[PDB]
Structures are given as structure tokens and as C-alpha cells.
Amino acid sequence: AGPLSGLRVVELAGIGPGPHAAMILGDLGADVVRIDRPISRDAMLRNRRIVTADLKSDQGLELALKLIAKADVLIEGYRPGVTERLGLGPEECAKVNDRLIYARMTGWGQTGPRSQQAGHDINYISLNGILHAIGRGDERPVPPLNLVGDFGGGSMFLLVGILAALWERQSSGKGQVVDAAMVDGSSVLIQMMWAMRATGMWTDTRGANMLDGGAPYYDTYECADGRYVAVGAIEPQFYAAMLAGLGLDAAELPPQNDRARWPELRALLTEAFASHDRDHWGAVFANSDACVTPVLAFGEVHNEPHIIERNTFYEANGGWQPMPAPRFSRTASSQPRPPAATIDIEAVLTDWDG
Amino acid sequence: AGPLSGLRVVELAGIGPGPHAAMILGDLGADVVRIDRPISRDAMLRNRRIVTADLKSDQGLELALKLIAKADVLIEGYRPGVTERLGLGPEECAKVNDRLIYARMTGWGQTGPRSQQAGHDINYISLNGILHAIGRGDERPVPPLNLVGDFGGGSMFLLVGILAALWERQSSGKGQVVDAAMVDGSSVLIQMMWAMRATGMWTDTRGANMLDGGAPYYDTYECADGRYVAVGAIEPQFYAAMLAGLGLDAAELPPQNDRARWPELRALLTEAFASHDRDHWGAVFANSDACVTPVLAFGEVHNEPHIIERNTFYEANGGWQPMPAPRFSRTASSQPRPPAATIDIEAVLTDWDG
């Protein structure tokens, strides 16, 4: 029901970014067909049809090619060379479908000294300065889950590449190959820090900057009950609203941006936030511009009113799952269809007319 | 001359996710005109034309609308209602140009108890379970910069929304409004953890999961020189390669996935990595499938061979900046044009024939 209704996608079963990108297309209305080796409980595989094929066999290669012959997009996330040796590489695909957006999702890229090397998110972000910048200054870097490599700088860039190439195709009449490497996407994801580095506004010191937990006004605080609030009161007026709620006299504190006294500032705020429960502060700052919010664990998210009101999550069999994003005023997406039984590839071919 | 060459984008100057989305469009060849309030050293403002106008005045509003009538996309990132009051709301823009993709970038969304409330990245990810999940278990949550709210679940979702709507526009001949809320995008960004929580494969316990630093084989380790390597050896055979490079006898270690013995495994690995310098580990692995990589600080990145060969970065003046991502085989993106002097708004309108 979304904006991508009409769009046909072949997804070669992979892990991490590939399936995430395929899920978002499906979310937004795309007809995604995932080819697996010969009924799912991975919510990630919502909004598909699943077929099965041995791509190492003559019959399996031939069917996949018939399916690809009728697709708009192909998603693959294997090592470079893998689809080639299978006979499903870009050059082989062009012979059956020159309108195909051949989307290749990797960590290191299609080429380069590391392109044949195994890796995971933490590796791609360690090589480009990102991982080094995450965590407290007094200890080793901490991975920001696999949000930055696999998803933010991964599947999200594959998607931009895919949708950008479809725009191109409206005038060229032709597809092309999208080489989405997590080491690249994630660097453009963090371009703000690269920009700020050049103007003296970000340093290579972990835990000592405006947005990394270094600023007492941009960090979490432990409250009386061991639970946490997030403070993000960057602007002076929001910061002022923040002090007031805490019952602190501004004239008694160090200036917000005297970094020399940041330890003193943080200590006073720590004492303030520790004096009451997280839910107390959420009540104090409920409607304010203080940029103070309760840090909710996954299990609690479903009870937060702004989360509820906006239907950010739906209940899908044994748990909450995020509704599609972003939102569209005219061609709104449907609630995702759950993973179902595998179906006959020929039936998919029949549907598509292949 | 990237794939979005031809696309016309009016960007109403803002902070964080909006400019980043506009940057990525321009990176990929879009004609982006940024209207600012009346030459930059924010490399983030690369690939633009900058014009200036007073949107509150009769005249400034008039020109902005003339610009908008000739555009494909409008990006705005203010509080809901702001453009409405200016006379640049979706309904007003529709009257001049019903093909316009009106892209509204916010943290809380257009509607809901928090839609009028101030906030920043940290606040949006505090409300949807994300920030709670980030950092060591024994400490308060750490913010993963503004990578997940502003960018990964922010600009990136705005971008996917923009390009999805353009796809739909081919059929309907019409545009629509994209409501891109960081609270929504970041939740879809983290869909994997929502999926896993439902099958017992992820817990709300910070720092005690497979991908959050909890697993000894998926975390950083400090080396003899006080620098760090990242270990990402999820699969048995990568883990096995990792142990072989360390000179550890697997028969003498606890099993990779015996969680009960993780502290013991981590102590053994800690002791090993601490015995030589990062660049020694750098060299011992460097080539293998051990998923061990050096943790490079921003300042070191430009010296890494894989970074160099693939031209992930370019030198702007005074520093390295990320080249466009992802990459396109046929319509390759140009090296970004640096920020230039403000252009005359009438001159852009002349260009666009507006």
C-alpha cells in the first residue's frame, strides 16, 4: 500500500544489511522475492515471498535467472566474486535484463586489499575512525551494536543507491550496479564529525566532545532508582529550562560551556538527578523544552504515550515490531505481513510473467 | 554527474539530519538550493547553491514559493507548524506544485504528545529502547554520537522516503508529504534487535549480548601500546582463525559460546592481545579471516591502504572528507564541490526558468 508498490525485488538470502534493505523495500510496498537454499520466526523476514533454489545446480541457476529477468532490483550480500562464480553476476544478468539495479551489499567493497576478507560491522567501523570515537574516555571503545556498519552506513546506503538508480533509469532506460560498502556508507554517515574535525569542533579524544558523552549537558544520568535519564539540552534556553526543573540556581553553577569546569558542572547535575527517580524527572520535564527524557528499556517502550499514540510499533506474534518508516501522506504503507510458508517459484514466475 | 543529476531540491536551512540528507542528494548529482536566513567552512554544505531570503517577509516568501514551484523536493526540519505559519506549508506548496515531495525531518514526528517538544538525537533514542542498549553493563548508557537518531534513523530515512516518493510519482504523476521522525527511523534501524528479543536471542540487559560488547569474540581489546583491535569473529572458522593467530590452543580454552565461561575466555584473550602492540596484531592478522582489525583514530584513517585504494576519502582544504556513497557503475558521482559564495536567488530562478 506504500509508495514502492509495483516494484519487483529479488533478494539472495544473506545476513545483516542485505535482509534489512530488502525488508524496508517490502515495508514500503515492494514485491520482494527472497531466494533461499532448499515457516519463519524472524520478524526481519516480514513482507516477502520466500522461494527456494540450489543456485549451484543447473535448474536452480536457470529459475533464478528467469525470476531476475522480470525484476527491477537484485540484492546480493556475498563476498565479491561469489555471484559471478554462480553465474548470477552483473554481466550475466545484463544479458537477460539490462534494466536491472544490481545492488551489491558488502563491508569492504567490490575491490581493494580487504575486499576478499571476512568481517563484520565492528571491523568496518574500526578501520574508519568511528569505533574509536564511541564509549567513555577511560576505557576501550564499545560497539554501538551493529547499528552503524550494518544498518545506518549499510542497508540504508544500499537503499539510497537502489532508489537513486531507479530515478536514473526513468531517463536512461537502464539499470546499473550499486556498490554499497559499509566502510563507505558509514563514513558518509559520520561526515558531520569529519567536517567538525577540520574546524576545531571535534577531537580524536574519546569521550571528550560535545556529542559523545563528554558534555555534561549531552549525556545520561543515573537517577535515585538506578534507572537513567538522557539530557540533550544543547541550546542555552533549553539548558536553562533543564536547571530550573532540577531546582538549581544558574548563578551558582559554572557556565554551561566552560569546559574547564565541566567536571564540577557534571558533579552538580549528577547529585541533582540522583535525588529523585527516573519517572519523577519524566514527570518534571514532561512538556518542557529541557531536552530531558527517560531512558526506556525495550520492554517499557510499549507503555510510553508518544510511542503508543503514533503507532511506532505493532504487536506481531510474541512481541512488538517497528511499523514502517518513514511515513507517507498519500500512499501510506500497510502493517507488515508476517513471515509465511515458502511458495512455489513457478507460481512466482507465473505471477510476474516469466 | 551521479544518478540524481536532474533532481531539483530546495532545502530550507536547518541543523543535523536535514542538511545531511540534502548533502547526500547533492553528492549523487542533485541540484540542491539551500535557502538560508539573511562561503561556508562546513564541508557538510558541500554540493549546494546557497541563496538567502527572509521567509517571514512578503518578498522572501514570494521568491521561496517561486523556487519551490520549480523543484522536485523540499526539505524542512523545523517544529511541526513552523512552515505552516510561514505560508510554506504542504497545502500552500501543493497549490503551486502538486508534484513536490515535501520532506519533513523531525525527531518526534508531526503529531503526538511530544511533537512540539525540543530535543536532540539522544532524546529520540532514549524513548525507543536504543540508548538503553548501548555501552558497558556496569555503567550508565553511552550515546553513540548522533549516528543513530540524526543520521542512521534520520537523514537516511528521509532520503529513502524522498526517493520512494519519486518512484511513486512516476505512476501517479503527483507528490506527497514524507513524515520522517527519528524516533521511527531509528526503531526500524534497530528492527533486528526487536526481532531477536521475540525469540530469546536478545536481552534488555546492557552489555551482555552478542553484538553489544558482551561476547569476547565481538568487542575491542586493548593492546600493549594502549591502542586497540576490534574482534568480530562470530562464525566458528573465523573464531578458529582468530585463536590460531593468537597462538592459543582451542583445547585449553572454554568453548566460544559457553556464556557461563565468557569472563574466563575474555581474560585469556585480554592477556593475549595485551602482549603485543596494535600494529603487531595489525600485521599478524591484516590478511586473514580472523575478523581482527586495528581500531584507527580519525587522524590515522588516511594512512590505511584499503581506505587509500578505494578513495573512501578526499582531501578538501584543511582535511579529509568522505567521498559519496554508495557507488554507481555507470553514473558515478563527482568529487563534491566545496561550499561556495552565496549565489543571487534571482539567478537560480533564471536557471530553473522560475
Ligand SMILES: CC(C)Cc1ccc([C@@H](C)C(=O)SCCNC(=O)CCNC(=O)[C@H](O)C(C)(C)COP(=O)(O)OP(=O)(O)OC[C@H]2O[C@@H]([n+]3c[nH]c4c(N)ncnc43)[C@H](O)[C@@H]2OP(=O)(O)O)cc1
Ligand atoms: C551547534 C549545532 C549546530 C551542532 C549540533 C548538531 C547536531 C545535533 C543533534 C544532536 C540534533 O539532534 S539537532 C536536530 C534537533 N532536532 C530536530 O531537528 C527535530 C525537529 N526540530 C525541532 O524540534 C526544532 O527545530 C529544534 C531543533 C528543537 C529547535 O527549536 P527552535 O524553537 O529553535 O526552532 P523551530 O524549528 O521551533 O522554529 C524555527 C523558527 O525559525 C523561523 N525561520 C526559519 N527559517 C527562516 C527564514 N529563512 N527567515 C525567517 N525566519 C525563519 C520560523 O519562522 C520559526 O519561528 P516560529 O516563531 O514560527 O517558531 C546537535 C547539535
Ligand SMILES: CC(C)Cc1ccc([C@H](C)C(=O)SCCNC(=O)CCNC(=O)[C@H](O)C(C)(C)COP(=O)(O)OP(=O)(O)OC[C@H]2O[C@@H]([n+]3c[nH]c4c(N)ncnc43)[C@H](O)[C@@H]2OP(=O)(O)O)cc1
Ligand atoms: C543476528 C543474526 C540473525 C543476523 C546478523 C546480522 C549482522 C551480523 C554482523 C554484525 C554482520 O556484519 S553481517 C554482514 C557481514 N559482512 C558482509 O556481509 C560483507 C560481505 N560479505 C562477506 O564478505 C561474507 O559473505 C561473510 C559475511 C564475511 C561470510 O563469509 P563466507 O565465506 O561465509 O561467505 P561468502 O560470501 O564468501 O560465500 C558465499 C557462498 O554461498 C554460496 N551460495 C549462496 N547461495 C547459494 C545457494 N542458493 N545454493 C548453494 N550455494 C549458495 C556461494 O556459492 C558461496 O560459495 P563460494 O563457493 O563462493 O564460497 C551478524 C548476524
